[PDB]
Amino acid sequence: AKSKNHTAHNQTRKAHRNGIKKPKTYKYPSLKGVDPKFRRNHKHALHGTAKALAAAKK
Amino acid sequence: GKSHGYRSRTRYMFQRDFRKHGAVHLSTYLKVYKVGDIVDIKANGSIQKGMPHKFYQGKTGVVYNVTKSSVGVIINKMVGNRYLEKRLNLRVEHIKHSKCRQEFLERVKANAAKRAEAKAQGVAVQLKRQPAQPRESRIVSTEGNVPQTLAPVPYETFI
Amino acid sequence: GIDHTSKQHKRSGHRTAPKSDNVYLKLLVKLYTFLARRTDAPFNKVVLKALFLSKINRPPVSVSRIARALKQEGAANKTVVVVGTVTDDARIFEFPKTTVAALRFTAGARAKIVKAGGECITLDQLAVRAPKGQNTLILRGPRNSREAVRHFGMGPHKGKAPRILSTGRKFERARGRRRSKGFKV
Amino acid sequence: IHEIITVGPHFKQANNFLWPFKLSNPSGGWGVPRKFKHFIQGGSFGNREEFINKLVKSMN
Amino acid sequence: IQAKRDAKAAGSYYVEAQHKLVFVVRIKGINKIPPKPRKVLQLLRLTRINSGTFVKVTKAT
Amino acid sequence: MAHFKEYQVIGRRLPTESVPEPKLFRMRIFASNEVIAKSRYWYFLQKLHKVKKASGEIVSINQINEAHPTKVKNFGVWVRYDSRSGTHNMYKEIRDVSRVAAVETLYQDMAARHRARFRSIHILKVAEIEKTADVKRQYVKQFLTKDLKFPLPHRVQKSTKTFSYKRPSTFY
RNA sequence: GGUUGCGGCCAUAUCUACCAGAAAGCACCGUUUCCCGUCCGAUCAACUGUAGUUAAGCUGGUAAGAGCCUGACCGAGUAGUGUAGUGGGUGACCAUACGCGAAACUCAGGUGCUGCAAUCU
RNA sequence: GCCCUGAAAAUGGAUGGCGCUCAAGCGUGUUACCUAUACUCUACCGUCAGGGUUGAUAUGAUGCCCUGACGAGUAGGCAGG
RNA sequence: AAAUAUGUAAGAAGUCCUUGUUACUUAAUUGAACGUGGACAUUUGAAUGAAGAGCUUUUAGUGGGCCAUUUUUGGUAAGCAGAACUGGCGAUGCGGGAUGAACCGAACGUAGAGUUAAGGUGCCGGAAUACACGCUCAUCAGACACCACAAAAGGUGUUAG
RNA sequence: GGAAUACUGCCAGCUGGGACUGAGGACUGCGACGUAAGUCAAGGAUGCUGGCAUAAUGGUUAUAUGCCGCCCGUCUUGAAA
RNA sequence: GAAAUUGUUGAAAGGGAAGGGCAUUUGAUCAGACA
């Protein structure tokens, strides 16, 4: 009982029915995978200016 | 059976360029990458540690991370009918700053100019790129140039 | 023929009336299409829509979430509009005057509101008072706080609550969920 | 018409404003026996230049 | 007309500007068209036979 | 390919900064319309020079009318043709009134005797034979004997009705 | 311009054979008490800068030189190729139409450019 | 090139058949003409979309009105009946 | 070292300036990252198109496929076996190819009038026993793609070279 | 030397024959012709005349005639098999 | 007191099936609408 092994036939047909969905961009992407030594400090840095820009509104 | 290892099929792809084997020249290491930098990816075979996968050869991405001897490049790989996001950890030897954007970047600086050059003048700019236009009327002379007449040529052999 | 480029005969995919069968609702909707059609005020067509909204896309606005909104910069005299039921919140202690206009006030909500010298207004009275919705503040409730959306998007590494009946250990918290039992998510 | 034939500064807008023309089959036929060849090869497709008019009329 | 004559007069050749405008007519039916042309056909709004549109001629059209 | 016209075509390679005014070349081309004439021009030019239409420019296209179009003329013709097995140079002589006439029948003859379609033919030269006795083909010399006459034996009047009441007669 | 120390690009820098190199500098060169290393003070280590030399290194120049680099309608719009046809041909294959387009070849030109610092008739 | 030789199978039989030979054959040209559920104009049905209109003192507001584009269909979905 | 095919970029999430934050980093308020304050509008930065774009939930059937042109592997070969891209058949009638799942043409609401495709027009059969130049005579002529086959090799048949 | 003509193209030049269609239902628009009153071919057919007033037209049905039409259901890549 | 199926009567068609589609002739039958 041999049968068909594998084909790509008609697959792009299907991908194109509903997309190839352009990759979707975000301003402010994530820091995922960003070096932690950086990120540790970067946290404190923002905390800092946040505090400052609070004291700016006194 | 079949074979599909990490570097399979990559014979000529990771090969080294004719008469360009040996050390990687020292500029490859003096170059300086920042986040947001666009880089083109091309594996250097002599450098085994931190190679991209074959898929990402000739691919272009954006730096999202900078580490001691590496940059993290994010690529959009598309699978099925959609793109997913891939962070690649690459060594500085498989990466170069991309020229994919300097023409733009050159053009902006240039556009800002002849816009202020025009503003400070009397507006009148037109600075979108237009594509190749058809050429205009023109007159061709014969002073020094009469048309030579050619005909097709009989069949021959030389052998 | 035509090399079509877009599904032929597609329905807009938006409601056009409520699905509900309530006269009163059908009346409110009757009012507001008229307003929406002849006032060019954008506030009216927003409402006209929401009146078609299914109960899910109508989460309740709490009376505390109302008091917050009035704490906006320059908002405390606006009259909030809510195209859904409004409910009471034992957790605020100080509630303001204002004028809340809605589809339903729960007993407690209307209570509390009024105790503070406020006023509960039906959407049709809101109409006569503010035909272009002058001075209105439209609030929406939290759509995504539904228990159901907890389970939407279920899959590996998405951390999103099994569709599960009984829970506690012994209930899907072993192989696949920890590093020491095969693998984790 | 003018903005169209002179290809004016606003041709994109002008030309798009016009719905694609929907003309009939050439009245007295295509002049060729087989359509799907180049004009040069005695068939109907391709750039046939100033000869487009003779056609477009018959079909309009 | 007078440019062409004035040139012949002068022993020369007047080459007209290449055309800026063309007019396209879809000539083929609806089926068995390969993707890339078929996409372009659409882009030029020629999605049914014998319909037709004007096309401003640049390299990029 | 149809009923022929004859065109002078003129192209040149596009001008460069460092080579403005390229060289200008002419071809007499026998074609039916002149869209085909320009095509043919480019066909041959690329078979002679480094150009292609892309980097060249037609400068002029002009119809050449036969000079003495009611003068019976003996044409010698030179043609490069392509058969099935191989390719072949060939010389024919055609007697007619215009070169355009002549080229029309050449093509017919190459279709009939050699099954040569249009694509596979190259007119090399078509030129008027001045003095007879330089005419070289007996199927034409035949037609220059002095005081030449001939009957047209076995007449065939074409019937205009399905039936006839006569019985025909091919006298003439 | 020369030279040196650190370089970038990594043969227009390499290869072969000749020849020229002022001044400085590099060099070769002298020595074995000391640290140091060798079967061997040849390399490596120290010490002198004194006793010597342009021989080599090095730099440059010559060559119908090898190589390498650059150019060109030199070959070639060739080979190959995307598109088309109820084109040819028993076939093998081949023409034609709208496009893209090499490599060898041939001929010509060339033979390191250059950054920082110190130095020099 | 066309034609002929090369050229052998089983019920009687197939350029589709008749038949055609300056063809009703082969190559090539030029016109006219025939006719698809396709193209163009129009009517009508239905689907989808955009507008308009609660103003009584008459009858459907899920209505009434204007306008445009679209219509193949197994498995299968949904809708109105 | 091509052709086809393939990554990215073509701005407001933009380009500059002024000088805060930190525990990171520098010889160094050096840098890095995130900011504050300020300067420049649609020729705001190619084309064409856009009966709009984005997003979410749920569920059917299906998970034997087969064909054509091109690329292509095994096989002498196959109406054989297996891949690549696209187009189809499957699921689809209509006109053409006599006939035919897949070729050509063209994709279907009920109809009138017109024009056509592909293919035809002696008669069957709607439509020129039209026009034009050649070629061919077969005691086994020939007659339109897919397609329903013929080869080497020969002819002082005839044509043109 | 000086015309003609062919060919290709243009005219918001004039004009004949034939066929299908007549959706809509006060007005409302954009126009055209008039010195004007007014007229009109300008946001979809009217006028005039005749014949039958019934099986005349039309429906239904049987038959004949031209062309066309294989047995449904099913599994299947593929069934009239 | 249906259907399959049957007898009689009446009408019609039938050169190796019958039934079907578009169309019209012919026969039979019939609704309407007219004033």
Ligand SMILES: [Mg+2]
């Ligand atoms: Mg099995």
Ligand SMILES: [Mg+2]
């Ligand atoms: Mg099998």
Ligand SMILES: [Mg+2]
């Ligand atoms: Mg399978």
Ligand SMILES: [Mg+2]
């Ligand atoms: Mg393998």
Ligand SMILES: [Mg+2]
């Ligand atoms: Mg596996």
Ligand SMILES: [Mg+2]
């Ligand atoms: Mg080495």
Ligand SMILES: [Mg+2]
């Ligand atoms: Mg390792």
Ligand SMILES: [Mg+2]
């Ligand atoms: Mg909760």
Ligand SMILES: [Mg+2]
């Ligand atoms: Mg006509």
Ligand SMILES: [Mg+2]
């Ligand atoms: Mg005519």
Ligand SMILES: [Mg+2]
């Ligand atoms: Mg006609």
Ligand SMILES: [Mg+2]
């Ligand atoms: Mg034909």
Ligand SMILES: [Mg+2]
């Ligand atoms: Mg017409």
Ligand SMILES: [Mg+2]
């Ligand atoms: Mg366009």
Ligand SMILES: [Mg+2]
């Ligand atoms: Mg002449």
Ligand SMILES: [Mg+2]
């Ligand atoms: Mg010295």
